[PDB]
Design a protein around this ligand. Structure first.
Ligand SMILES: CCCN(CCC)C(=O)c1cc(C)cc(C(=O)N[C@@H](Cc2cc(F)cc(F)c2)[C@H](O)[C@H]2C[C@@H](OCc3ccccc3)CN2)c1
Length: 390
């Protein structure tokens, strides 16, 4: 591991997001910021909000510059409205550099901030193409690279605990690592496999095959990427296109058929609980996603365990049972490889080489019988046809 200063700089959990500490302004104002590879705006609470115990105070920053422009960002989930400006930004546990970056000062929001998440802003790490108001608003990471010598690459190790973290525990627990400008080899085991970034807007990839316990889901691969497939730390669940979700759930139900679960469970809405330590991991199937490789006609697969797709939640009775929610849900906007999927892997966003790398995470949750995996190569033909074109 060559980036010790950035190792263990993340906190949080899949259900509320993973955040990194940042400072904005002069003198520096410390804020916790949601790491979001699924959007491209850097925005911070800039006005009192019931769920915020701190916010960006522009009038206290001598380096604050007003862009005299409003900004609106409607995500899939919530939304916020703000005022554009620029200011000096640093990452305490990051590269020892300070950059001037665009900042959306959030003045109004709806279903955006999360009670108890401990974060006050969002760091959109994707490309300018999806930045609001438009692509002229340079994203933070682009500014970082243009203004410093930091390599155009970042890597994420999101660490799920495998069990519930109460409010005090999640504040004292290490949630992972965001290595800015490099790859830290202590964060993964085995080899890194790379899939092409199809197009630079979201971190778009192409899934070419899906297996549930080795059984081919057997759908036209274009269905897996309808209308796109993205890697998104800002979404908890693995979200799948309607038809793919229907097929996957039918197969996961068939594989786990020795136990019957209520429809509410499969809808990702209700928890299921087992007596302490008795979660029947073995009845649940592993899920493999095959991704386009960088070599013509070659693919590789990432394999996740139910310890990734079943999200630990506290029992509504705080009892001693081990409880979980099904973290796979339906999408109308394409596949979203969310945080629960990212928790099984060290993910390298190699912007410089337009590729995303995956390796088994040194912090993925597993059991003595099965582990997450990244394996290759596989001969795969016509993978370009798996991509969707509007
Ligand atoms: C339930 C709260 C949120 N949690 C739990 C915590 C992560 C979730 O699991 C969850 C569930 C769903 C169904 C959606 C989102 C979501 O929108 N997540 C947002 C980031 C985000 C927004 C927010 F309001 C609150 C957040 F905690 C994080 C991502 O950017 C999506 C948006 C989409 O790109 C659209 C887009 C639009 C404009 C500009 C750029 C991109 C692809 N990536 C998050």
């Amino acid at each position: 591991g060559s980036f010790v200063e950035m190792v263990d700089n993340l906190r949080g959990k899949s259900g509320q997001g993973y955040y990194v500490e940042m400072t904005v302004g002069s003198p520096p104002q410390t804020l916790n910021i949601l790491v979001d590879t699924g959007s491209s705006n850097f925005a911070v609470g800039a006005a009192p909000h019931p769920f915020l115990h701190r916010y960006y105070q522009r009038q206290l920053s001598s380096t604050y510059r007003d862009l005299r422009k409003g900004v609106y960002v409607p995500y899939t989930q919530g939304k916020w409205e703000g005022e554009l400006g620029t200011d000096l930004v640093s990452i305490p546990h990051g590269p020892n550099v300070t950059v001037r970056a665009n900042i959306a000062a959030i003045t109004e929001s709806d279903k955006f901030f999360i009670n108890g998440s401990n974060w006050e802003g969002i760091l959109g790490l994707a490309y300018a193409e999806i930045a609001r108001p438009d692509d002229s608003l340079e994203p933070f990471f682009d500014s970082l690279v243009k203004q410093t010598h930091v390599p155009n690459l970042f890597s994420l190790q999101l660490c799920g605990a495998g069990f519930p973290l109460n409010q005090s525990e999640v504040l004292a627990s290490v949630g992972g690592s965001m290595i800015i400008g490099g790859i830290d080899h202590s964060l993964y085991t085995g080899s890194l496999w790379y899939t092409p970034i199809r197009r630079e807007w979201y971190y778009e990839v192409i899934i070419v095959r899906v297996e549930i316990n080795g059984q081919d889901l057997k759908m036209d691969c274009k269905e897996y990427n309808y209308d796109k497939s993205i890697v998104d730390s800002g979404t908890t669940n693995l979200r799948l296109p309607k038809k793919v979700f229907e097929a996957a759930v039918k197969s996961i139900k068939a594989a786990s058929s020795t136990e019957k679960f209520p429809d509410g469970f499969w809808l990702g809405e209700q928890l299921v609980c087992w007596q302490a330590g008795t979660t029947p991991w073995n009845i649940f199937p592993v899920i493999s996603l095959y991704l386009m490789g960088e070599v013509t006609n070659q693919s590789f697969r990432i394999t996740i365990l139910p310890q990734q797709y079943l999200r630990p939640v506290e029992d509504v009775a705080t009892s001693q049972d081990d409880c979980y929610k099904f973290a796979i849900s339906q999408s109308s906007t394409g596949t979203v490889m969310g945080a629960v999927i990212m928790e099984g892997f060290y993910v390298v966003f190699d912007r410089a080489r337009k590729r995303i790398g995956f390796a088994v995470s040194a912090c993925h949750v597993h059991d003595e019988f099965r582990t997450a995996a990244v394996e290759g190569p596989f001969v795969t033909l016509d993978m370009e046809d798996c991509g969707y074109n509007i």
